[PDB]
Structures are given as C-alpha cells and as structure tokens.
C-alpha cells in the first residue's frame, strides 16, 4: 500500500531529523549545553546557551 505508508514514513523520518537536530553545533563550539555549563563561567556560558 502506498497511501498508507507515506503518512507514516514521512512522520517517522521527520521525527528522526528532529532527533538528529540536537546533534548539531548550530554555529557554536559544542552541541550539548551541559558541556559549556560545566566548563564555562556563567557570563560566557549564557552566550552559548542563547
């Protein structure tokens, strides 16, 4: 079946892309904010979290 399969595959792949979006640096020096929080002082940390 074609019509019943795309409506599930597109949603699953969009959810996979949403999950993968957390693995990107987004122009920063790290992906997870906890590394900056445990490594940087709060004035420099808040810029990376922003």
């Amino acid at each position: 079946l074609g019509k019943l399969q795309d409506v599930v595959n597109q949603n699953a792949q969009a959810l996979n892309t949403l999950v993968k979006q957390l693995s990107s640096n987004f122009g920063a020096i790290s992906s997870v904010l906890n590394d900056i929080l445990s490594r940087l002082d709060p004035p420099e940390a808040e810029v990376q979290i922003d």
């Binding site: 445990s38 490594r39 940087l40 002082d41 420099e44």
Partner: protein, 49 residues
C-alpha cells in the same frame, strides 16, 4: 612536558598571588578542577613584558 596519570591539584595554583596573569582560555579557572582530562601539557618560555 607531558603530565598524566595523577590527581590534578591546582588549589595552590589559584590561592597564590605571585603571578601576574591568570586568565584562562575556554576552560574556566573556577570549573578547571573536578574536570577529568585525558592528557595535560605544559610549555615554558621566558618573554619580555
């Protein structure tokens, strides 16, 4: 010089005041301790003011 396989101890590093510059880059001196690094290096040279 390469330093490894030991308890890093910087309490005497920040509790002293004989140094003139103690601004760290990227890592912060407040969060410098309690962080487990794989290897730590130390270079040394004499330069002008």
């Amino acid at each position: 010089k390469r330093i490894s396989n030991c308890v890093a101890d910087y309490s005497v590093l920040y509790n002293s005041a004989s140094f003139s510059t103690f601004k760290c880059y990227g890592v912060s001196p407040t969060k410098l301790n309690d962080l487990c690094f794989t290897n730590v290096y130390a270079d040394s040279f004499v330069i002008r003011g």
